[PDB]
Design a protein around this ligand. Structure first.
Ligand SMILES: CC(=O)O[C@H]1C(=O)[C@@]2(C)[C@H]([C@H](OC(=O)c3ccccc3)[C@]3(O)C[C@H](OC(=O)[C@H](O)[C@@H](NC(=O)c4ccccc4)c4ccccc4)C(C)=C1C3(C)C)[C@]1(OC(C)=O)CO[C@@H]1C[C@@H]2O
Ligand SMILES: Nc1nc2c(ncn2[C@@H]2O[C@H](COP(=O)(O)OP(=O)(O)OP(=O)(O)O)[C@@H](O)[C@H]2O)c(=O)[nH]1
Ligand SMILES: Nc1nc2c(ncn2[C@@H]2O[C@H](COP(=O)(O)OP(=O)(O)O)[C@@H](O)[C@H]2O)c(=O)[nH]1
Ligand SMILES: O=[N+]([O-])c1cc(Cl)ccc1S(=O)(=O)c1ccccc1
Ligand SMILES: [Mg+2]
Ligand SMILES: [Zn+2]
Lengths: 328, 426, 412
């Protein structure tokens, strides 16, 4: 329906390539991927689209974000759901990869171009924000905020106040917010020091269109777009007993559960309605506003071909596909 | 393992005197005296509620949190009142005004740091902490405002340790206060997002259960509070005894909350017979499950017959067969398959201690997580809108540094909490 | 030669105290004699404290009594991952200190209670760490699987679909005893609506005595623990025979006692006597180790079994010509001085893999799905260092155990 799903495999990593043990999934054709190659489970998985390891950021940009931009420009709020294995590398090269063309860079340019054309023809104004969910506290990345308090408007569409947005001057101004933000989140000191993978990063862009062609006095269409980087799941080891991870992992584990339970309930609410508990998390309640409604959504899962990704990519394909596959 | 009780506001304090009146006899602790215990088992586990200092002076490890001096000055000037170390009395000689905002933002907010100081002195006592018991009414300044702040701070300092709450939800028929739904809707809002076990008790559900199930014609408050304190002993301290199948606050929590909201339960005691005549001893066991699972006998206002159960915990305490227990629970699950929910193959959590309530042969605390409690947060949330529409006594809250959006927030949350509870009634 | 034991979870320790009671009682070793050969594990102190306070107090070393003063929790995750992790190293250290002291051991008779927190989750990793440190040994786990309708924990199936998947690739032969299908023996075959837990524990205390105690003891047809998993498991899944006893007669009511071999052996295959709600509804036996004890002529057995091999309504598997391990011990059973057990001069402690547990597993798996389909108590395990993975991926595990116990039978 509105939901469309695409999974983009990312090349095996230099070390993963050179070793080569049984591949987690073995991508068969472009769309169908077999899990657990010989027998073994030998599970065929279908998706709506799938992109192979050869498909880079630029191909996923064009695929994923093209139905996003059009709907975003139409005034339909859009979101991108990221996924990926817990192990970085696929997710590392999927997001924040400057060298890779960036799904986010080409879609930010794609929107940024389309935004300039809508402004010349029509008066279009936009704004952007960048927030994270670390410790289940929302931080703005642009300004050093504290815990955003919750209010509800007349619509009562739940607002975390104290968010600041600036209007997109160029993509360069956005790049400064991306830099400010990306350095504002900490690395996670557990394991190897990753980026802010374990914290959920959110990018927000708000389109606001008035028509010059339409009367000045008209309804304004606004969409919200969001891109979310999520954590990976934690094992016993990657968790650990330690009190240092302890807080962070509790925040992530309940965020992942309540969020993924809201994603499963989201697919059920493509039948259903008020059933889906928006309230189970702070961000999952804002995710209702974006992902709820009949809005065009896409999930991009990451998958690596490495054997390390055996568990992680199988669990993420399992969880992403589970919400599709369940229908009553 | 260990707990630290919390006597927030006058009602939670008045009940604290009754909770500790009971528990101490259930542990042979005289006023400042030691363990006189008729047995030896009422001592291998006391640590749960007390501290070692002298060698005869096991002191209750509670907190007494009140902005009204005359209350804690009636609890401390009466019977067991001289057991509490004076360090436990976190008084606020300020005006204890009946406003949730006055006890949460303005007058309670100052006294909190001098509370958290002691909640840490008592949590850092020794061994391993389990959680905190909380007693209060949802109908007043110090109960619902300040007592709900104390937990919003406890749940930030120890998000690992459990949080039991004993709320005196506003009774339907007559409200013992006027702003009541204001104080209530604003505390249940904090409760649904901090504590993880709530036991809601209603002064009139008690009067019914205390005037018809006890022929008691003059049910004083001391009696209501005594009945309540009889359950919260059969919950906690009870399961800190041996048993063929014991549990503890976590087993209770980890069997009784299917969804993270917290969920609120409805306690029920077992042998609830009037004194002389009704000492029928029809307490073999089918008579306890007969008792606990009827409508009346639930300390909540709402009737369980009006909604499915998600979980039940019959926390028995008295020597009985693990067959006539585990069996009876089944026929109860099948006679009433209608109201019990179906996506849980076994709703009931059987729990069995050995030692019974001092003077009795056999009892069983009931802790029901029924969807029937929907028909109470409905009640509270109605009384709110009917007066919130006109901003009735709202100038007492905003004039104490509040927000027109804060009332909106709490209603909408606790009114969503009604919606969610119906998702499982269906 | 020896077999250590590891009694885990409160119930694995209550059964432990009872199997351990019946031992000294048939070996003339009163309260203070030799030394035990086992350990006790719980994340609730008050229960292992019943072995430190109650009977059999000084028969143990405080070193073979592991406790985590912390919290049991009726959830696998916490008891496997989060908490039960902290204790494992210390636990292993005993089953490595007790395993060194001996002389050429054979294995560890584990005692756990499937649908617990400490009995599910901890043992899962205990057996895990054993199959690696001692893959060259026997790993016979004696479970008390979930009652078919009379479960206790609300979550039970979450705990028991997670002990099965994690231990499956690690056990050698998993004995099973159902708590409810024992109460039917206490009601029907003993007459008592007063079965305390202390009695089911005498009855597993009895069947278990027949396994290790009397069979590690000399006899006319000895059967090592390796002989079990060899003569009892057809396939590498940690296959789960059922325990059954024969002279379960009452020591008060009826008295026919003198029930020659020809009778006690027939009293094993009737479904009303097998400590398991896995009534042979279709389940073909595939291998049975009839342990006898007491006065038994090998011809009475090699005739009392021959009659059974030709009953045909007992239908063995096709690929199994003869699946009858006769074990004969000398010393008769040894009943509790004044419990309720008859006291006969012979018994049959038959155990067997049956295709019947195709049911028991199916009915326990279907349970799990109904709650997991709504997540139910999932937030209690995810907050404890687990994932959507370990549930969904241990569910897929037991799915190929519904198919394994279907394919190994029903077909020819
Ligand atoms: C001669 C005799 O057997 O007297 C009984 C008695 O008559 C009855 C009626 C008791 C009596 O209880 C009440 O009348 C009552 C009064 C106010 C509120 C609630 C109840 C009794 O007072 C209560 C008392 O309870 C206990 O001793 C328990 O240990 C109980 N203790 C307290 O509540 C307590 C009271 C005063 C001071 C300190 C503690 C308890 C229950 C659960 C958990 C912990 C403790 C008992 C058996 C009796 C009397 C004395 C008449 C009953 O109540 C309880 C809680 O056991 C009322 O129905 C039961 C059935 C009992 O048979
Ligand atoms: N036969 C027998 N079954 C028992 C005994 N004690 C408990 N059980 C059963 O085992 C299960 C109970 O496990 P629990 O006592 O809750 O837990 P545990 O496995 O000891 O570990 P925790 O959950 O962490 O406390 C239930 O299915 C009981 O019916 C016992 O002494 N004998
Ligand atoms: N059971 C019970 N309820 C009480 C007691 N005292 C006050 N209440 C109830 O508490 C509500 C009033 O709140 P109150 O305790 O005075 O608030 P506070 O003292 O300002 O925190 C009313 O609904 C009363 O019925 C008591 O001792 N026992
Ligand atoms: O998705 N993200 O939010 C994200 C998560 C991480 Cl860890 C890293 C980056 C990004 S980004 O903004 O896509 C981005 C993409 C390209 C350049 C800067 C930022
Ligand atoms: Mg236990
Ligand atoms: Zn005879």
């Amino acid at each position: 329906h509105h939901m469309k799903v695409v999974v983009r495999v990312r090349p095996e990593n230099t070390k993963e390539k050179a070793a080569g043990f049984h591949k987690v999934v073995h991508v068969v054709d472009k769309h169908i991927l077999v899990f657990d190659p010989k027998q073994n489970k030998d599970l065929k998985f279908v998706f709506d689209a799938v992109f192979d390891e050869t498909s880079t950021q630029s191909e996923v940009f064009e695929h994923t974000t093209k139905p996003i931009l059009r709907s975003f420009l139409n005034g339909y709020n859009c979101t991108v759901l990221a996924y990926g294995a817990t192990g970085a590398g696929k997710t590392h090269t999927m997001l924040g990869s400057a060298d890779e063309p960036g799904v986010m860079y080409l879609t930010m340019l794609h929107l940024y171009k389309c935004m300039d054309e809508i402004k010349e023809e029509k008066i279009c104004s936009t704004a952007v924000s960048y927030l994270e969910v670390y410790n289940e506290q929302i931080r703005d990345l642009l300004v050093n905020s504290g815990p955003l308090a919750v209010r509800e408007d007349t619509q009562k569409g739940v607002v975390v106040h104290g968010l600041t947005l600036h209007q997109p001057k160029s993509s360069e101004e956005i790049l400064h917010l991306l830099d400010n933000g990306n350095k504002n989140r900490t690395q996670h000191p557990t394991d190897m020091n990753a980026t802010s993978s374990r914290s959920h990063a959110v990018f927000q862009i708000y389109l606001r269109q008035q028509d010059k062609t339409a009367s000045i006095n008209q309804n304004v269409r606004i969409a919200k777009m969001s891109l979310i980087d999520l954590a990976g799941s934690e094992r016993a080891s990657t968790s650990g007993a330690k009190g240092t991870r302890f807080v962070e992992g509790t925040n992530i584990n309940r965020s992942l559960l309540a969020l993924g339970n809201v994603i499963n309930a989201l697919a059920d609410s493509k039948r259903k309605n008020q059933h889906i508990p928006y309230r189970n998390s702070k961000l999952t309640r804002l995710l209702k506003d974006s992902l709820g409604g009949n809005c065009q959504t896409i999930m991009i899962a990451a998958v690596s071909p490495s054997s390390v990704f055996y568990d992680d990519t199988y669990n993420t394909l399992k969880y992403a596909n589970r919400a599709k596959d369940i229908k009553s | 393992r260990e707990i630290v009780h919390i006597q927030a506001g006058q009602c939670g304090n008045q009940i604290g005197a009754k909770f500790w009146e009971v528990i101490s006899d259930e542990h042979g602790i005289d006023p400042t005296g030691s363990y006189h215990g008729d047995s030896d088992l009422q001592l291998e586990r006391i640590n749960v509620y007390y501290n070692e200092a002298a060698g005869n002076k096991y002191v209750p490890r509670a907190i007494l949190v009140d902005l009204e001096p005359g209350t804690m000055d009636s609890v401390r000037s009466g019977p067991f009142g001289q057991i509490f170390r004076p360090d436990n009395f976190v008084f606020g000689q300020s005006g204890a005004g009946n406003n949730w905002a006055k006890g949460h933002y303005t007058e309670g907010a100052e006294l909190v740091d001098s509370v958290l100081d002691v909640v840490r002195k008592e949590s850092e006592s020794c061994d391993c902490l389990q959680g905190f018991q909380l007693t209060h009414s949802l109908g007043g300044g110090t109960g619902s405002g300040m007592g709900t702040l104390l937990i919003s701070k406890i749940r930030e300092e120890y998000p690992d340790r459990i949080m039991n709450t004993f709320s005196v939800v506003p009774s339907p028929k007559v409200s013992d206060t006027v702003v009541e739904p204001y104080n209530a809707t604003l505390s249940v809002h904090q409760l649904v997002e901090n504590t993880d076990e709530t036991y809601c008790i209603d002064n009139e559900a008690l009067y019914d259960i205390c005037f018809r199930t006890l022929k008691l014609t003059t049910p004083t408050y001391g009696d209501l509070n005594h009945l309540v304190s009889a359950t919260m002993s059969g919950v906690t301290t009870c399961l800190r005894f041996p048993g063929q199948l014991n549990a503890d606050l976590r087993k209770l929590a980890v069997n009784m909350v299917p969804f993270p909201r917290l969920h609120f339960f409805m306690p029920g005691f077992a042998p609830l017979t009037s004194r002389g005549s009704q000492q029928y001893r029809a307490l073999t066991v089918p008579e306890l499950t007969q008792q606990m699972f009827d409508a009346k006998n639930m300390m909540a206002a709402c009737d369980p017959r009006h909604g499915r159960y998600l979980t039940v915990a019959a926390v028995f305490r008295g020597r009985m067969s693990m067959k006539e227990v585990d069996e009876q629970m089944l026929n109860v699950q099948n006679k009433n398959s209608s109201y019990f929910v179906e996506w849980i193959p076994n709703n009931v959590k059987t729990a069995v201690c050995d030692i019974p309530p001092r003077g009795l042969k056999m009892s069983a605390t009931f802790i029901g997580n029924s969807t029937a409690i929907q028909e109470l947060f409905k009640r509270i949330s109605e009384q709110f809108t009917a007066m919130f529409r006109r901003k009735a006594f709202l100038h007492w809250y905003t004039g104490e540094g509040m927000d027109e959006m804060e009332f909106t927030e709490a209603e909408s949350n606790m009114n969503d909490l009604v919606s969610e509870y119906q998702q499982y009634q269906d | 030669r020896e077999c250590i034991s590891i009694h885990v979870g409160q119930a694995g320790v209550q059964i432990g105290n009872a199997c351990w009671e019946l031992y000294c009682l048939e070996h003339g070793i009163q309260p203070d004699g030799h030394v035990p050969r086992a350990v006790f594990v719980d994340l609730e102190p008050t229960v292992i404290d019943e072995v430190r306070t109650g009977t059999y107090r000084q028969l143990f070393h405080p070193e073979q009594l592991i406790t985590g003063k912390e919290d049991a929790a009726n959830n696998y995750a916490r008891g496997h991952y989060t908490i039960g992790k902290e204790i494992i190293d210390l636990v292993l250290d005993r089953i490595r200190k007790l395993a060194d002291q001996c002389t050429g051991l054979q294995g560890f008779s584990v005692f756990h209670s499937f649908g617990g927190g400490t009995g599910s989750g901890f043992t899962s990793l205990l057996m895990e760490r054993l199959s690696v440190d001692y893959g060259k040994k026997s790993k016979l786990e004696f479970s008390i699987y979930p009652a078919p309708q009379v479960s206790t924990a609300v979550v039970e199936p979450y705990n028991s679909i997670l002990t099965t998947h994690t231990t499956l690739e690690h056990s050698d032969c998993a004995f099973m005893v159902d708590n409810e299908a024992i109460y039917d023996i206490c009601r029907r075959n003993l007459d008592i609506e007063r079965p305390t837990y202390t009695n089911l524990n005498r009855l597993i205390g009895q069947i278990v005595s027949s396994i290790t105690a009397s069979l590690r003891f000399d006899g006319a047809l000895n059967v090592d623990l390796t002989e079990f998993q060899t003569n009892l498991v057809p396939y590498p899944r940690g296959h789960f025979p059922l325990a059954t006893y024969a002279p379960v007669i009452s020591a008060e009511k009826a008295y026919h006692e003198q029930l020659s071999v020809a009778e006690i052996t027939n009293a094993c295959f009737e479904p009303a006597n097998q400590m398991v709600k896995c009534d042979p509804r279709h389940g073909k036996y595939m291998a049975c180790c009839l342990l006898y004890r007491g006065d038994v002529v090998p011809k009475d057995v090699n005739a009392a079994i021959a009659t059974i091999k030709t009953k045909r309504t007992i239908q063995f598997v096709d690929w199994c010509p003869t699946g009858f391990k006769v074990g004969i011990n000398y010393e008769p059973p040894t009943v509790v001085p004044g419990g309720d057990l008859a006291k006969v001069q012979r018994a049959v402690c038959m155990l067997s893999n049956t295709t019947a547990i195709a049911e028991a597993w199916a009915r326990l798996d279907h349970k799990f799905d109904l709650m997991y389909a709504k997540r139910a108590f999932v937030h209690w395990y995810v907050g404890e260092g687990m994932e959507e993975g370990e549930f969904s991926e241990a569910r897929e595990d037991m799915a190929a155990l519904e198919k394994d116990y279907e394919e190994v039978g029903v077909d020819s």
